[PDB]
Amino acid sequence: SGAIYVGNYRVVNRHLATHNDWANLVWEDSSRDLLVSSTTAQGCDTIARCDCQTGVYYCSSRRKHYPVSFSKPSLIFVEASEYYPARYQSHLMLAVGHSEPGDCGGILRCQHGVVGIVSTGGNGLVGFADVRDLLWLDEE
Ligand SMILES: [Zn+2]
C-alpha cells in the first residue's frame, strides 16, 4: 500500500483505489495502473520533474529503502499478477530488486522529488509507475 499526496491530489495504484477515491475521481488510466483522486487537505509531496535514472525506493516487505538504477518510462510486458493478467503496462520503469504485491504504492524518489510508485514485481525485478509526465499535478 501507499500513495503520493501533492496539492489537492492523492495518487494511488488503480488496482488499490478505495470507494472514496472513485467517488472523488480526477483521472485514471488502467494501462498505467494509476488513479488520482481529489483531497480536502493539501499534501506536501513534491513530484520530480526530470529524467533521472537513479533513486531510492521503499520496499515494505523488507522494511528497507534501496538505492536503484531504473529504466526510462516505457511499454513493458508484465507477467500475470494477483491483480492483472499478463499484459503490456505503459509508462513503467524497471529496476533489479524485490517487489511483492503488498509493496505496491511504495515511493521511488530522486534528488528532485517523487518519481513514481511501485506497481509490478516478480522475476527479480521491481516496476514503478512513472508520474513525472503528469505536469497538471503541480497546479489547479
Ligand atoms: Zn530527478
Curated annotation (Swiss-Prot):
It comes from the Viruses. It catalyses: Selective cleavage of Tyr-|-Gly bond in the picornavirus polyprotein. The active site is at residues 15, 33, 104. Zn(2+) 1 binds at residues 50, 52, 110, 112. Homodimer. Cysteine protease that cleaves viral polyprotein and specific host proteins. It is responsible for the autocatalytic cleavage between the P1 and P2 regions, which is the first cleavage occurring in the polyprotein. Also cleaves the host translation initiation factor EIF4G1, in order to shut down the capped cellular mRNA translation. Inhibits the host nucleus-cytoplasm protein and RNA trafficking by cleaving host members of the nuclear pores. Counteracts stress granule formation probably by antagonizing its assembly or promoting its dissassembly. This is Protease 2A. The lineage of its organism: Viruses, Riboviria, Orthornavirae, Pisuviricota, Pisoniviricetes. The chain holds residues 869 to 1008 of 2193 of the full protein.
